[PDB]
Amino acid sequence: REKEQFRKLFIGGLSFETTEESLRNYYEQWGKLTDCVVMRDPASKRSRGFGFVTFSSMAEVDAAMAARPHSIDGRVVEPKRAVAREESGKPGAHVTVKKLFVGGIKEDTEEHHLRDYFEEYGKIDTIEIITDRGKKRGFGFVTFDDHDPVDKIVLQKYHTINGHNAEVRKALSRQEM
Amino acid sequence: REKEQFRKLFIGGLSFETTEESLRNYYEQWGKLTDCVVMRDPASKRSRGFGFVTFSSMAEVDAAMAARPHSIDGRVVEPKRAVAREESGKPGAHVTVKKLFVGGIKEDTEEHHLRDYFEEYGKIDTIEIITDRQSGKKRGFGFVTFDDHDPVDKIVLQKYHTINGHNAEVRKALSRQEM
DNA sequence: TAGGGTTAGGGT
DNA sequence: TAGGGTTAGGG
Numbered sequence: 234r235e236k237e238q239f240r241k242l243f244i245g246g247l248s249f250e251t252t253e254e255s256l257r258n259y260y261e262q263w264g265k266l267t268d269c270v271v272m273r274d275p276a277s278k279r280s281r282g283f284g285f286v287t288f289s290s291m292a293e294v295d296a297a298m299a300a301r302p303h304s305i306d307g308r309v310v311e312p313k314r315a316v317a318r319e320e321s322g323k324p325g326a327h328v329t330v331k332k333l334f335v336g337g338i339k340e341d342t343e344e345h346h347l348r349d350y351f352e353e354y355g356k357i358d359t360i361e362i363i364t365d366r367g368k369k370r371g372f373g374f375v376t377f378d379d380h381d382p383v384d385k386i387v388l389q390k391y392h393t394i395n396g397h398n399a400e401v402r403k404a405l406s407r408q409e410m
Numbered sequence: 411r412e413k414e415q416f417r418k419l420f421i422g423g424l425s426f427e428t429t430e431e432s433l434r435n436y437y438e439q440w441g442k443l444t445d446c447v448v449m450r451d452p453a454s455k456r457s458r459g460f461g462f463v464t465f466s467s468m469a470e471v472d473a474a475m476a477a478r479p480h481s482i483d484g485r486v487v488e489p490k491r492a493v494a495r496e497e498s499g500k501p502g503a504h505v506t507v508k509k510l511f512v513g514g515i516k517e518d519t520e521e522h523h524l525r526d527y528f529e530e531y532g533k534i535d536t537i538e539i540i541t542d543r544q545s546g547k548k549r550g551f552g553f554v555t556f557d558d559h560d561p562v563d564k565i566v567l568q569k570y571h572t573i574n575g576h577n578a579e580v581r582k583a584l585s586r587q588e589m
Numbered sequence: 590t591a592g593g594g595t596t597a598g599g600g601t
Numbered sequence: 602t603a604g605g606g607t608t609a610g611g612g
Contacts, residue, residue, distance in 0.1 A: 245608025270611060277545040283608050311608065318610065324501045327609055328587045336590025363592055365454065372590050400590060407595055408505045409588060422596025447599060460596045488596060495598065504597055513602030540604050551602050579602060586607055 237268070239388060240294055241287045241315035247271065248308040249280040259305050260286045264293030285315065298381050314384040325405040329380045331358070332404035333387075336372040337397050344373075346395040351375050355382030374404060414445070416567060417471055418464040418492040424448065425485040426457040436482045437463045441470030462492065475560050491563040502584045506559045508535070509583035510566070513551040515576050521552075523574040528554050532561030553583055 234240075247256065257269040268287035273280055288294045294314070297303075303310050313329060320326040335347060344360045351357060355377045362373040377383060383403055386392070392399050411417070421433070434446045445464035450457050465471045471491075474480075480487050490506060497503040512524060521537045528534060539552040556562060562582055565571070571578045 241610095243609065246606080247608085249606080268612085272610060274542065274544075275611090276547075277542045279542060279544040281608090281610095282606070283610090285610065308606090313608085316609065321609070322501065324499065324503075324588075327589065329608090334591065338590080361592070366456065370590085370592090372592085374592065402591085405591075407591080407593090407597080409502075410504070410591065410597090418598095420597060423594080424596080426594080445600075449598065458596090459594070460598090462598065485594090490596080493597065498597070506596090511603065515602085538604070549602085549604090551604085553604065581603085584603075586603085586605090586609080589603065589609080 234289075235291050237287055238315060238317055239291055240267070240289070241285055242294060242297065243283065243285060243313040243315050244303075244305075245283045245311045245313065246308065247280065247282055247284055247310055248306040249282060251280065251284075251306045251308075253284075255306055256284055256286065259303070260288075260297060263288065263297040263300065265289045314381070314388060325403055325409055328403055328405065328409070330383060330404050331377050331380050333375040333377070333383050334372065334402040334404050335375060335392075335394070335399055336402070337399040338373060338394060339371050339397055340369040342369070342373070342395045342397065347373060347375055350392070350394050351382075351386070354386055355379060411466070412468050414464055415492050415494055416468055417466065418445070418462055419471055419474065420460065420462060420490045420492050421482075422460045422488040422490065423485065424457065424459055424461055424487055425483045426459065428457070428461075428483045428485075430461075432483055433461055433463060436480070437465075437474060440465070440474040440477065442466045478560075491560070491567065502582050502588055505582060505584065505588065507562060507582050507584075508556050508559050510554040510556070510562045511551065511581040511583045512554060512571075512573070513579045513581070515552060515573060515578050516550050517548040519548070519552070519574045519576065524552060524554055527571070527573050528561075528565070531556075531565055533557045555583075 253269050253271050271284040344362050347360050358376045358378050360375050363370045387401050430446050430448050448461040524537050535557050536555045540549045565580050
């Protein structure tokens with residue numbers, strides 16, 4: 234089976250009273266959990282307002298994310314696919330967006346190439362192939378109706394599209410880069 | 411005199427018609443410029459929408475920033491203290507915020523200490539000393555929110571600041587998403 | 590392989 | 602030395 238990283242969900246905005254027990258009972262609705270933790274301050278043991286749960290398979294995570302919104306202990310939480318600790322310190326590592334940067338597609342890639350490839354990850358709202366104000370600059374953007382497709386796509390850094398070793402990144406604004 | 415970085419302003423949101431002549435003509439109201447450039451696309455020569463002006467002293471930039479807002483060729487621009495090229499790639503390097511992160515102040519630093527130190531950089535809107543909600547002990551860092559972003563930008567040009575007898579570190583305040 | 594009327598660098 | 606009732610990791 235896939236690594237823990239691909240079976241783990243970051244659950245943000247937990248109620249400070251949420252415990253490993255109550256967090257476990259809820260997400261077990263979609264399968265067996267191999268791990269569950271509420272992150273706390275080491276000194277005071279106070280809840281930090283987030284935690285992690287690990288499902289037994291990717292399919293169990295996809296099922297959980299398909300059943301949003303999630304409410305735990307009377308508070309609406311925001312589950313997200315886990316970003317690896319090694320990405321800490323990089324700009325935009327933990328930003329949640331609906332738009333995807335796609336680079337390395339060169340000049341022979343058009344909107345329909347991206348649509349055929351990415352449509353399987355979720356509902357596509359818009360696709361943009363960047364040009365010069367009219368040559369193609371080699372990269373474009375894909376905007377989904379939800380952030381989870383973007384989060385799932387970026388778990389694989391490189392994606393073969395239209396015969397190119399393409400690179401995917403969560404879309405960042407100018408200020409954030 | 412200070413180095414160029416401390417005498418240079420990033421001018422964002424320029425009108426695409428603005429040229430180096432009109433940009434100089436505008437900012438020369440506050441002193442002599444040692445450098446001035448409008449950034450352009452090398453291939454198509456189209457304006458990239460920003461440029462840089464470098465004054466002869468830090469008093470001139472401060473005078474220029476004291477006269478905001480700035481409008482050039484019919485467009486309101488956003489001048490900012492220049493962030494060094496070496497900072498590219500760091501989270502929040504180019505973000506514009508009114509709030510300042512202050513670390514290394516330990517448990518013996520209170521609001522008035524931050525107030526006394528930072529009041530000279532600009533008007534302070536709020537000050538927060540972070541504590542543990544359960545233990546109540548101070549966690550060794552706080553935030554200072556100004557009414558403008560420029561005081562923050564000027565402060566962070568000096569990474570280390572002696573506050574209340576501590577080697578304090580200042581950073582532009584970032585949201586959870588940006589970190 | 591960082592867009593966009595969204596604003597991070599070229600240099601006698 | 603990363604908050605905030607604003608959400609990036611312990612075992």
